[PDB]
């Protein structure tokens, strides 16, 4: 069991800054550093994948009316609604290969080992979700990134989210078939609190324990370094705080 | 003719959206977007640059080439960007 850093670091009122930290921490990781596990929450917002263009995916006017923040993340996937009822976590480790499918599969096993502590029979997961059998509802979605020396995996777990919002934010081909997808979503996703009575901090504590055991890492709480701090602010100032970025139009490195 | 279209395509994991701007038989512009993974990530820009402007006939040449430079596109096969990018 090697040493890792647990970062309990969040800016729920600023999802853009939250995603900046995620990229900073990924980007300044030198091969051989202590692996990192971050936990965090976002207030009402839609996060689109890297290859996504906001206007094609989500209803911008519904989002503005209801004060739902738009944000684009560094990784592919996947547009998703987040609120204070989603537990978000990311893991950054050293990498010596480019097998991203292994990473996805490993992290899924750690999620499963974590939900077993809570008495839940959780199941992967072709690649990037975890579900509870009922015939199965998705309770967690994931994405990630790799580069020479480092891999990033991050996921959002539905603990006590408003499941109705997942469909209310998406852009519908015709507004009549808003109902075929809404009733299909509710039948395919659930909260962890639908099955067990847990607070968000006990879900987290199970995750810390599951990830420590499965990854053979001893995660001790740590703070962000100055190096990770600056890079985050810079990434916010130059990239995450821009309309061009969040609308899905900026696809080049600006550091 | 001048022709512009927009197309979705469900792959095994993901959704490729394409917008093509066609001048006769030739690709004037292209924009690829949607729900997928691709490493390197800025390989998406290479794929658009390559198609712009070739001939809608020699698309597969470009797809198969692109992949032979070693691009990883989990749960999205090369014949998925073929279905996405095909009009007729």
UniProtKB/Swiss-Prot annotation, chain A:
Keywords: ATP-binding, Cytoplasm, Ligase, Magnesium, Metal-binding, Nucleotide-binding. Its EC number is 6.3.1.20. In contrast to E.coli, where the lipoate-protein ligase is encoded by a single gene product (LplA) with a large N-terminal domain and a small C-terminal domain, the same activity in T.acidophilum is dependent on two separate proteins, corresponding to the two domains of E.coli LplA, respectively. Residues 31-219 form the BPL/LPL catalytic domain. GO terms for cellular component: cytoplasm; protein-containing complex. Pfam families: LplA-B_cat. GO terms for molecular function: ATP binding; lipoate-protein ligase activity; lipoic acid binding; metal ion binding. It is an enzyme of class 6 (ligase). It is found in: Cytoplasm. ATP binds at residues 73, 78, 81, 86, 133, 138, 142, 156. It catalyses: L-lysyl-[lipoyl-carrier protein] + (R)-lipoate + ATP = N(6)-[(R)-lipoyl]-L-lysyl-[lipoyl-carrier protein] + AMP + diphosphate + H(+). Heterodimer composed of LplA and LplB. The gene is lplA. GO terms for biological process: protein lipoylation. Mg(2+) binds at residue 142. The keyword Magnesium applies. Belongs to the LplA family. Part of a lipoate-protein ligase complex that catalyzes both the ATP-dependent activation of exogenously supplied lipoate to lipoyl-AMP and the transfer of the activated lipoyl onto the lipoyl domains of lipoate-dependent enzymes. Can also use octanoate as substrate. SUPFAM superfamilies: Class II aaRS and biotin synthetases. This is Lipoate-protein ligase A subunit 1. It comes from the Archaea. Pathway: Protein modification; protein lipoylation via exogenous pathway; protein N(6)-(lipoyl)lysine from lipoate: step 1/2; Protein modification; protein lipoylation via exogenous pathway; protein N(6)-(lipoyl)lysine from lipoate: step 2/2. The keyword Cytoplasm applies. InterPro entries: aa-tRNA-synth_II/BPL/LPL (IPR045864), BPL_LPL_catalytic (IPR004143), Octanoyltrans_LipM/LipL (IPR050664). (R)-lipoate binds at residue 138.
Swiss-Prot record, chain B:
GO terms for biological process: protein lipoylation. SUPFAM superfamilies: SufE/NifU (SSF82649). It catalyses: L-lysyl-[lipoyl-carrier protein] + (R)-lipoate + ATP = N(6)-[(R)-lipoyl]-L-lysyl-[lipoyl-carrier protein] + AMP + diphosphate + H(+). Keywords: ATP-binding, Ligase, Nucleotide-binding. GO terms for cellular component: protein-containing complex. One of its GO terms (molecular function) is ATP binding. It comes from the Archaea. Its EC number is 6.3.1.20. Pathway: Protein modification; protein lipoylation via exogenous pathway; protein N(6)-(lipoyl)lysine from lipoate: step 1/2; Protein modification; protein lipoylation via exogenous pathway; protein N(6)-(lipoyl)lysine from lipoate: step 2/2. In contrast to E.coli, where the lipoate-protein ligase is encoded by a single gene product (LplA) with a large N-terminal domain and a small C-terminal domain, the same activity in T.acidophilum is dependent on two separate proteins, corresponding to the two domains of E.coli LplA, respectively. Part of a lipoate-protein ligase complex that catalyzes both the ATP-dependent activation of exogenously supplied lipoate to lipoyl-AMP and the transfer of the activated lipoyl onto the lipoyl domains of lipoate-dependent enzymes. Can also use octanoate as substrate. Heterodimer composed of LplA and LplB. This is Lipoate-protein ligase A subunit 2. It comes from Thermoplasma acidophilum (strain ATCC 25905 / DSM 1728 / JCM 9062 / NBRC 15155 / AMRC-C165).
């Amino acid at each position: 069991h090697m040493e890792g850093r647990l970062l309990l670091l969040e800016t729920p009122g600023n999802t853009r800054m939250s995603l900046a930290y995620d990229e900073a921490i990924y980007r300044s990781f030198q091969y051989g550093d202590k692996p990192i596990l971050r936990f965090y929450r976002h207030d009402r917002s839609v996060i689109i994948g890297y290859f996504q263009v906001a206007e094609e995916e989500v209803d911008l006017d519904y989002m503005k009316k209801n004060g739902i923040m738009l944000a684009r993340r560094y990784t592919g996937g996947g547009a998703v609604y987040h609120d204070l009822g989603d537990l978000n976590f990311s893991v950054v480790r050293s990498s010596d290969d480019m097998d991203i499918t292994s990473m996805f599969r490993t992290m899924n096993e750690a999620v499963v080992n974590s939900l077993r502590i809570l008495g839940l029979d959780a199941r992967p997961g072709e690649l990037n979700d975890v579900s509870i059998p009922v015939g199965e509802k998705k309770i967690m979605g994931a994405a990630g990134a790799m580069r020479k020396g480092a891999k990033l995996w991050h996921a959002a777990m539905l603990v006590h989210t408003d499941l109705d919002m997942l469909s209310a934010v998406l852009k519908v081909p015709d507004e009549k078939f808003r109902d075929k997808i809404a009733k299909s979503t509710r039948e395919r996703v659930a909260n962890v609190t639908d099955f067990v009575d847990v607070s968000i901090d006990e879900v987290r504590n199970a995750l810390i324990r599951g990830f420590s055991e499965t990854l053979h890492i001893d995660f001790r709480e740590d703070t962000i370094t100055e190096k990770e701090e600056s890079l985050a602010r810079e990434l916010f100032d130059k990239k995450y705080s821009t309309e061009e970025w969040n609308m899905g139009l900026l696809r080049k490195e600006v550091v | 003719m001048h022709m512009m279209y927009s197309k979705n395509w469900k792959a095994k994991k993901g959704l490729i959206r394409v917008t093509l701007d066609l001048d006769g038989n030739r690709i004037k512009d292209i924009h690829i977007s949607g729900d997928f993974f691709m490493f390197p990530e800025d390989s998406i820009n290479r794929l658009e640059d390559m198609l712009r402007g070739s001939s809608i006939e020699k698309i597969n040449d470009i797809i198969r080439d692109f992949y032979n430079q070693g691009v990883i596109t989990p749960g999205v096969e090369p014949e998925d960007f073929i279905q996405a990018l095909r009009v007729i």
